[PDB]
Amino acid sequence: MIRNRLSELLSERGLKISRVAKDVKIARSSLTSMAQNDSEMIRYDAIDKLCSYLHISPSEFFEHNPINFDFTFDEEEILVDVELDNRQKLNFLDVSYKETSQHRFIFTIKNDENIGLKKYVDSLSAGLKNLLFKKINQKLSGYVSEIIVLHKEILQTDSRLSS
Amino acid sequence: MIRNRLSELLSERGLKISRVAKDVKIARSSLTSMAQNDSEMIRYDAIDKLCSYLHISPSEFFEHNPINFDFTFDEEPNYKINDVFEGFANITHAFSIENFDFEILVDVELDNRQKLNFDLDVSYKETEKIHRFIFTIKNEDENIGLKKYVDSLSAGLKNLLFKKINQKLSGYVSEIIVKNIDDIEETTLHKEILQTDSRLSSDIFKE
Amino acid sequence: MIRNRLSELLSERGLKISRVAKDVKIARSSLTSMAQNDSEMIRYDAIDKLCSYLHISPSEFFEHNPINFDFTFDEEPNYKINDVFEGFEVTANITHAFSIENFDFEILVDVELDNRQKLNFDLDVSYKETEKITNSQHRFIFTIKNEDENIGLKKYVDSLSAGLKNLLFKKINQKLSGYVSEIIVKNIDDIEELFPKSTTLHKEILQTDSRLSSDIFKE
Amino acid sequence: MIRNRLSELLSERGLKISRVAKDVKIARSSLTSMAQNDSEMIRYDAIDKLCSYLHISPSEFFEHNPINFDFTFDEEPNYKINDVFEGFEVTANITHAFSIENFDFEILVDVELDNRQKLNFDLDVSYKETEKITNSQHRFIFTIKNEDENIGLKKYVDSLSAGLKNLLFKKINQKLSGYVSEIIVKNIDDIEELFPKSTTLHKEILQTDSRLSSDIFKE
Amino acid sequence: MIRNRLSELLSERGLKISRVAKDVKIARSSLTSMAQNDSEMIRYDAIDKLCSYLHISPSEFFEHNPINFDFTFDEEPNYKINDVFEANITHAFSIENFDFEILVDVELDNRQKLNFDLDVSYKETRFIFTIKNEDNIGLKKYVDSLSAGLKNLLFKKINQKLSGYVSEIIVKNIDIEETTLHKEILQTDSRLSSDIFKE
Amino acid sequence: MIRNRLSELLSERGLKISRVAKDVKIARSSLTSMAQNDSEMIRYDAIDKLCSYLHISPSEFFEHNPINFDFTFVTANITHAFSENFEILVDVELDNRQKLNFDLDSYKETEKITNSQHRFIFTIKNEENILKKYVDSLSAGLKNLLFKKINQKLSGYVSIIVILQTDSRLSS
Amino acid sequence: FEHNPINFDFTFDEEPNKINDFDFEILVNFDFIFTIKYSAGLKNLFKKINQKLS
Amino acid sequence: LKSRVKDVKIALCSYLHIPSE
């Protein structure tokens, strides 16, 4: 669980993406992608150029939490595996379709044994939780569209969870 | 100036590339390079995995100093190459250089926007055999300000800077040399020139 | 900023363009271009002849202010274009061919002083209305949407003289004209008139020019 | 006469051509051409950048003198050329290909002062010998015949400064070399060597440059 | 400014082009053309025969004055022509406004050269033009100095050149055949009427 | 008999043909031809520009005399090419209409000062010493012009032979 | 056979060295005849390592 | 324990503490 903090810092200091790109000589698209926790790799040069410009040590740019989450699906259930440190691996479910520019199916988990999992999710900070929420949805949405298969409308459609 | 400070941590811990490779499912080949500070891009999954396995925080997996050094090489160098047919593996048998002088422009940007500027001049000295071309700066008294800035850095950053500048110097010399030398069939002469490297020795960059 | 004070000198001394063009042996077209500041490169011989004929040292021929403004426009703007079918073919009129709903983009200005320090101001521009200068030509009129936070730019601009401010005002408008026209031409294709010397919509929209009225930038 | 004083300023301030080119974002070739006076047309942006970077007004960037010299070469000279045979092919030594017996031409100099009145001085030049200063490149030497009846021209030239005098000398020699090389190449055809990178006689003679050495036109 | 004085001499003597053409054996057309000061070249042979026949010195034959007038016409004129679709030139084309600048460069006996500038505007219809600024009085003071004959020659030169600039512009801008319109305008002339060049 | 005194004026004032041509904007060849009394027709513009430049009235430019004269008729070496042995009817029409008539009648010898120029000396047989008094009164320039004209015309007639470069001399 | 409450994980290096016309790292958490607490029936796992080297 | 019994690393005796059955 790791995330950038560029989005916030930029909001706090009042600077807009446009100036940041011109001053640090980095393409707008890459800088925009790096601020939403989308890119998978962060070029070292980018970290040094930004840290120098925003006058911040790399302590602020990166936010880390040792707790990790593992998700597993079959080819036929969201098998989350809270994996805290000390190799204290744990296991936690069943979700079923409930109801249906933005088409969104609201699948809903329906199961008094999630009390430990809910406590674990509550501990994560706002940004990491938002990353976790985006990650769980992205994974399921990728898998769900496979069942439906010109314009590939299903690809644009995503899934949703609630609990 | 940013480095990854992986090797240091691993040594004090007492582990080895081999163990970590499996303990955290990271290709042995990649985990090797990322330890020599010589990989352009680092992924996030690596950061979290390594930070957790060694119970550390990102703050100590990175070292950052505001000063940045940029190196622009000369476009018109004064060089004489004397094709020697006798002898050709030796390199000295294939070609020797009477002279080779070019100008290095170094720009040092401090924390404050202030952009101090320094100028350097380099000259061919001799050919040692570890072969390795050796180049030495001419003026180190009119340009001592650069030396003060280089020493203010830590050991790792200085080592990285030295690795970078030496590689860049090797690039200009090897590329310029390959253009005015006739290739001879054997590991051809051109291939031997490419593998060759050059080192700059001075008080300003002692290590 | 630098300019050729040829026009002011010619106006003051009372000479006309033809008399000078014939006497110093420089071609009229080139001389009348150098009267304005459209020309990019000037020849040494022209400077020598014009300085000798008018009894002036090169100090009075050039006026230089150390300040230097830079202009860069937003790469990804917001534009809304509605196709209008009101019989453009019969009469070549801008309003008939199309209408503009909303046009928003960012203009970043980077005032650089004589000192090595560099300031930074931002400007937001919006479309207001199209106007009729001649019954054959029109000029779109935009307006800056933030003047309470950019009083500095007004303070620095007013430090210039009349000619250099005229030169700057021409530069910003000319750059705005090309950028706005390029977006419209890329978005909408061309239509030719029914009765032809025939002029298409692309050429007509390329010839037209924009303007950026604002309390800060005038004259 | 007018010249750009970039070289003297760069020498005085201690800066070097490489540093200036990187700082003002101008290609080194153009800047080193502008260091001399070979360039004919210069850009406004170059003037602004170089004046801003060096903290100088344009009054110091240009030096101007109202005087103006115009040289018109004769259209009918007397050329005496012998096609000496000495195996030029073995070694490209110009003197082997040919020798000059007697080359005489008339140079008409008009000196236009700041006042509308103008004077007129006439000069006669003759061939003498070949300097052979460099084994690869030889320079022809010509001397002004009448110096006693043209003393007035010397008085006027000495009123100019060092740089403008240098510029004047560069012009008379460059034009004299073009007039001579053109005449010589018109008289004799070309011969090429078998063993090269091969250079013909035409190309070698065009490369060869002359020089007019006399007290009036010193330095 | 140089003119031949043959026409004045023949009238005072009492002869006529017809008589001389036979006495000096010179073609009648050539002799009568050389009599109107409008031939570009005079042959050496002609001077000796005529000088001997009239018992006159060459100095009497030629009249010379140092002042030289050079006229340069504008290259960008304000021409506005109203086309009429109903030969009489007044029916083909009618001129609204035709304004251009004439630059005059009087060269005195001394090397010093004075400069005067004149503006010319269309008045009515021989397309008669007139000069806007007559005060530019320095040019007039000099025209008066020229003798009676030389002044007439200068007036003829300006009138012919004016026709050149005008006719060309009009014919090169307006289209017709019924001696067509084009063959009429080129023949049409023009005259600059004002006190400065009064004849 | 009419000639222009440009050459004498240029020699007297010290000016050279090169400078005069540039100042008066007249081609060098035309001015050179005019300065040696060769061209047949001349322009008014040249007369005015030259007179103003030299500050001279046309009186000095032209020299005229009413007396007129009328005439009526193995190797590349010219001498070896051909190989044994005409009368000239001259008049002296005076200004008073007192026309007079003179008769002069063969090849005497050939003299070539140089290989480049061959001259045939057609000395006159002296068939009227009164003609000679008339030629004497003339000035130097007009007499030289008369010599040049008669030599040119008679040489042209003799080059009968058809070689062209060679010129015939009628001397006495 | 005998239920074993212990299983072993062995992994050699992927880059061994020596030839003429051999030191490697075995991963088990602990770390020509090549030399260097957990019934003798099963112990005879030893058999698997034998085939591993050759 | 069902897909859930992954921990076996197979697309038991020491895993569920059961030759036994």
Numbering used by the authors:
A (entry chain C): 1 to 76, 106 to 121, 123 to 130, 136 to 146, 148 to 185, 205 to 218
B (entry chain D): 1 to 88, 92 to 133, 138 to 193, 203 to 223
C (entry chain E), D (entry chain F): 1 to 196, 201 to 223
E (entry chain G): 1 to 86, 92 to 130, 139 to 148, 150 to 189, 191 to 193, 203 to 223
F (entry chain H): 1 to 73, 90 to 99, 101 to 102, 105 to 124, 126 to 147, 149 to 151, 153 to 181, 183 to 185, ...
G (entry chain B): 62 to 78, 80 to 83, 103 to 109, 120 to 122, 140 to 144, 155 to 156, 161 to 166, 168 to 177
H (entry chain A): 15 to 16, 18 to 20, 22 to 27, 50 to 56, 58 to 60
Q: Which lines from the publication concern this structure?
A:
To parasitize a phage, the SaPIs employ a transcriptional repressor, Stl, which in addition to repressing the SaPI genes, senses an active phage infection by binding to the phage-encoded anti-repressor protein. Here, we show that the phage satellite SaPI2, which does not encode orthodox anti-phage defense systems, provides antiviral immunity mediated by Stl2, the SaPI2-encoded transcriptional repressor. Stl2 targets and inhibits phage-encoded HRs, including Sak and Sak4, two HRs from the Rad52-like and Rad51-like superfamilies. Here we have focused on two recombinases, an annealase called Sak, and a recombinase called Sak4, belonging to the Rad52-like and Rad51-like superfamilies respectively.
Investigating Stl2’s oligomeric state by mass photometry showed two peaks, one corresponding to the dimeric form (54 kDa) and a second peak of 626 kDa, indicating that Stl2 displayed distinct oligomeric states in solution. To further analyze the oligomeric state of Stl2 in solution we solved the apo Stl2 structure by cryo-EM. Surprisingly, the micrographs showed circular structures as well as long curved filaments, highlighting Stl2’s intrinsic tendency to oligomerize mimicking its target’s architecture. We generated a cryo-EM map of the undecamer state with C11 symmetry and discovered that the circles were composed by 11, 12, and 13 dimers of Stl2. We extracted particles with a smaller box size so that three complete Stl2 dimers were resolved imposing D1 symmetry at an overall 3.7 Å resolution. Notably, at the interfaces of monomer-monomer and dimer-dimer contacts, the local resolution improved to 2.5 Å. The structure of the dimer displays a peculiar butterfly shape, where the N-terminal domain (NTD) and the C-terminal domain (CTD) are the body and the wings of the butterfly respectively. The dimer-dimer interface corresponds to a patch of the antiparallel β-sheet present in the CTD and the α-helix 2 present in the NTD. We first analyzed these two mutants by mass photometry and confirmed that they displayed only one peak corresponding to the dimeric state, indicating that they had lost their ability to form circles/filaments of dimers. The Stl2 apo structure therefore suggests that its ability to oligomerize into large multimeric structures is the basis for its promiscuity in targeting phage-encoded HRs from structurally divergent superfamilies.
